Amino acid sequence: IVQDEILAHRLGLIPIHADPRLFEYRNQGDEEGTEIDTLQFRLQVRCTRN
Amino acid sequence: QPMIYICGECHTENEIKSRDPIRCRECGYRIMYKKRTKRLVVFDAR
Amino acid sequence: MIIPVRCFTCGKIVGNKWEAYLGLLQAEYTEGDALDALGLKRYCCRRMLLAHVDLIEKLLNYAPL
Amino acid sequence: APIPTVEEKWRLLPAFLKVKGLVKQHIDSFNYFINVEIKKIMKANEKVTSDADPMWYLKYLNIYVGLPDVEESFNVTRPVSPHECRLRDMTYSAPITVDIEYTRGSQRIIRNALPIGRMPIMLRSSNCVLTGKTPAEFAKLNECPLDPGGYFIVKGVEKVILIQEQLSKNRIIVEADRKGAVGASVTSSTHEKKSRTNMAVKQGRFYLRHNTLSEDIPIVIIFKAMGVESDQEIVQMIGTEEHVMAAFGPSLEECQKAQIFTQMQALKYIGNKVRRQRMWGGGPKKTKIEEARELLASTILTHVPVKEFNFRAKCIYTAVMVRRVILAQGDNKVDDRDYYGNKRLELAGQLLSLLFEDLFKKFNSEMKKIADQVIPKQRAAQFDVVKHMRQDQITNGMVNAISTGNWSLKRFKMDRQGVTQVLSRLSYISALGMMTRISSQFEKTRKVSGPRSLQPSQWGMLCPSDTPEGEACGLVKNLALMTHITTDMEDGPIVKLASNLGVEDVNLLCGEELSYPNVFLVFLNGNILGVIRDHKKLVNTFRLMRRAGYINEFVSISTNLTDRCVYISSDGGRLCRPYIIVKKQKPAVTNKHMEELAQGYRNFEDFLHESLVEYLDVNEENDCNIALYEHTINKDTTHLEIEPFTLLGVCAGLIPYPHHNQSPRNTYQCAMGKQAMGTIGYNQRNRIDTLMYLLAYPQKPMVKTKTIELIEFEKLPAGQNATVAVMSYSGYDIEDALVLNKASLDRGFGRCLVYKNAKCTLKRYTNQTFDKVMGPMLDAATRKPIWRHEILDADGICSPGEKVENKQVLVNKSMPTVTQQPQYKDVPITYKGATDSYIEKVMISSNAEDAFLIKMLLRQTRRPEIGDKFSSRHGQKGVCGLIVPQEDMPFCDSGICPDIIMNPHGFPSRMTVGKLIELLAGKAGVLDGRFHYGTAFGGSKVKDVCEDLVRHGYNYLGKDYVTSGITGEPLEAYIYFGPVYYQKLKHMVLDKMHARARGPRAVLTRQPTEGRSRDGGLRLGEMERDCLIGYGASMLLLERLMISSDAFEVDVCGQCGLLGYSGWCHYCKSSCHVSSLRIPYACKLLFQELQSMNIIPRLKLSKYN
Amino acid sequence: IAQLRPGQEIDLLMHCVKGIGKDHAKFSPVATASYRLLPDITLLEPVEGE
Amino acid sequence: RCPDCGSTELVEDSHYSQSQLVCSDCGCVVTEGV
RNA sequence: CUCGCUUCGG
């Protein structure tokens, strides 16, 4: 029910325990991202009856 | 080509082809929404 | 619709303190002492939790399912 | 020794709202109309027959409306929820069926259930499916439990029939004319005829004017015509005061100048002064005296009845009217129209009753005409009505009248417009307040004076603050929180009690008794019920009987001592309000009664029956003495106010501490809050509307009025509480502007969602060819859909979840051009939009006409920015002038940085102390975890919140020590910090921003189009041209009005002076004198129009030198 | 993060990149970073009694 | 066909509420205004 | 598209 943009905004506000000093600023563009300057989090929840 | 829809109360996957009167099996309800797309969508946290 | 993750003014994480707050209301606690026990000192987070309406379950009652 | 106070007295208000109040007006009126009134109308028109072929008839037996159903299924009905009617763009109606008996071939044939029409069904009415349902059942039906209901659904749109306000009928009105002459008027209206008859004093003598008379005639002649012939009796009826005879003498002299002395002579005079109604077909012996007598008996003063050509009562009525005119001709006691004791409210029920009566009469007339055309000529195959009873007549009439909103009743000569309006779904408060609106009989069409004013009669009945700010200020009004509209009564027991109470019959005495100082006339709905002495006993007995229950509690009795008239009102539409009865300085309501009410022993009806609370009409409350509070009760007090804050309406109930503000601020807040952004209902996700505004994280207000609790506004909030600090910052908040915090907006403050609708139809035409949607046109180069068709699914309809850009197709619609192979031309539904939008859902339905209805719900997520309008629940509408970073914001010792910085300068001019008190109360409440109340004429006092603040360690006045965010140094002055309930308005800069290139032009005059929706350009009005002229800028004026708008080059013949084409003059058949000339296109259109009007403009050209 | 009902599903991936709170408030590390001057209340004359 | 370069790549592309049939190769505006 | 009607905004 939560809209996609609202869900993304909520996910952005969640703090991440990763140490920022170990990464670098992502370059302008480069939406793919590399190992140095990004992290990936998978969220997969399927609700079903008990 | 299987075109799939979801009725408003059964919420069951119904495959209907072109020029079919809009209905649903195991119901008679006639509001037939379309399923969400499979293409990836990118959103900005801003 | 749903409890905001962050407090609007200060920015303290308030999203994770919602359901537990309800537990304190499911218990005998008043509003003020429950907010004190949750650790909301400045009044902005107290306004965040106190004035929030949980519309998500009422909307989910109208969800397809 | 202060008088004891019943603290729980306010608890009477919710109990009342359990049975009446906000929305129950329309619902009760519609239930009465569909359960009682329709049967009365059918009984009035039960038998229809034709003059040709007697012994043939069609008789109606019983009528039913049934439950709402849909005719989609082939000759089969199916129960339908209102939300389904909303989605399918169909009407939410129920089948009007009737059982009849008629004669086919002189053999009686009866039908027990024969459909004839469809009634659009008001939501939450008796027949509506939503009534008597639980919130879980509401969820199963996809309807919000908090929806007010009371509105019709026609063709998918929600229409509300506004409550009409009009002057009461059959009442004497003494008024001044344009020339200052004090005349009289009465609009005698019965169930059949409305006629306004006037009395004038134009030459010191009284004439009676009516539309059926060629010329106004002296009143004495009319008196002689109506049976009374002696002049002395007429003078006795007028009055025995000396000045009355002095004033009425000239009329007697004028009568005596003519030789009119008998009833026959006056009847002959009137018949001479009679005008034939356009050669009325059929002549009953050169009628004249009979015409005059019929006009006197029927047409003139219709509401006054003549038993059998006995004009005694009508004589008394006109004598009373003459006496009132004479008395008002001295002391200028001219009655005012704006007094709401003379006003009546028509709900949806009465309007629908009139419409159904007209439609049923038309249906019966059509049936009779068909019978006349068919029966006497056809065959031994006997004509029967069932083969001719068209069922679309009533249904189409109802649907068109409700949808378009224009009502044309030829039987009543009533042409009304704007009866129904589209229900506004901007917010819950918007719909709730629109549900209780009242429209005026006069329109903002002109600058009137008086109705627009706030009359004191609106007390307790209508909201004083709630009125639309603009051209319709004062002409659209809102009902108060605790009010009731009366219905019609039987009028029988009132007459019986009045006769038994000593009221002498008027026919038994001469008119001289009317002039006695102690004799009081008693009326009843404009009819003289009689005369009485010692009217105090009669009034007290009538009120006591009404309290006892033998008389209906809505029957009103009032006394006018100046005119010495006791008025008894029993007609419907009058405004009433409950009041606590006070007997000898002690209220009938005690603490024990309120305790029983709280415990559930008794309800409001029990209070009504036990003579504790009684309804007061405006006319009746004119004679009563009402005390606002217990301490105000004195010896001469007859009633007690239940709750003062019920004076305000529904929208004005949102204002915290409204009594601390200036009234224009309250009016602005009512208007603003009608437009507040917020949640609509629990089914706002399944609902698909043309435009919907939602708030991401709505919050209930910290300072809530009891009206908010009563209407359950906190369940559907329409705003957010922001930590407002009142200070001047950066000079970006000069005039009503406010500064927003960038971090707050980044954390979801003010985040809003805009839902728009895009609907398409695929209809099958008369020829067996239909609209079809192609699949996406794949690009052969890349084997992928082209950029325009990027979002389309395999079926040619855009799939939910993707984002749409400008000039992209949502539905790949292609339609035939024939109506031999079909030829399809493309008319795809493109998305016109400045910004990207996301498709949330796509709904596909099929109507009975095989028309495929497709609706896409596009969603946009908008963040507050520069230009977004913000309100503060106190009429302090503002624009976000600057968005500063969080670190630049000032901070307190605790580290709190404000979300909104509002300029202090807005306070002194507007004196909105209520905002300051609300801020203080909200700060105290959030500190101690409470919800303070800003109830009108009450609420939490300043002292208590100050004590709470000092107890919590903050300053007792909200002002806090603050360090500047920029310089890092403390501010010299303490800053006023606190949570304020700010609400975002629908007015956004993104929607309002407009820019115009060359763009399109209009065909008639080649100038840019009008509106933003049509990509129109801005307009240089007449005053802009005047300002440019005043500047003297000739070249810029020429460039703006000629070069940049409608420049054109025409060919003018220098010989004939007319317009040629392509360097050739057809008139002169030559091309030597044709010269090109620059000109505005509108001027060329004007010249051609003038030529068509035979006003030939001939242009004599010359060289520019 | 969100609330679901049976049948509903949330499947997504999140790319996290380094950023400063000036660009967006979601990057701010501190809930509240503030300072106040140390008070020093002084008594001009000796106060005794109630 | 485009009157300038002779191509047949005539695309109907509306640019900010201005209907416009334009060559897709050289950008020559063939027709404009409705 | 034209036209009218309403509701807004100011």
Ligand SMILES: Nc1ncnc2c1ncn2[C@@H]1O[C@H](COP(=O)(O)OP(=O)(O)OP(=O)(O)O)C[C@H]1O
């Ligand atoms: N019908 C109208 N004609 C011309 N200008 C208008 C009209 N309605 C609004 N405006 C514009 O709005 C401005 C009216 O504001 P003004 O009357 O001075 O303050 P206000 O609306 O009384 O606010 P307060 O109630 O004093 O807070 C001035 C004018 O340019």
Ligand SMILES: [Zn+2]
């Ligand atoms: Zn189904």
Ligand SMILES: [Zn+2]
């Ligand atoms: Zn906070």
Ligand SMILES: [Zn+2]
């Ligand atoms: Zn010529």
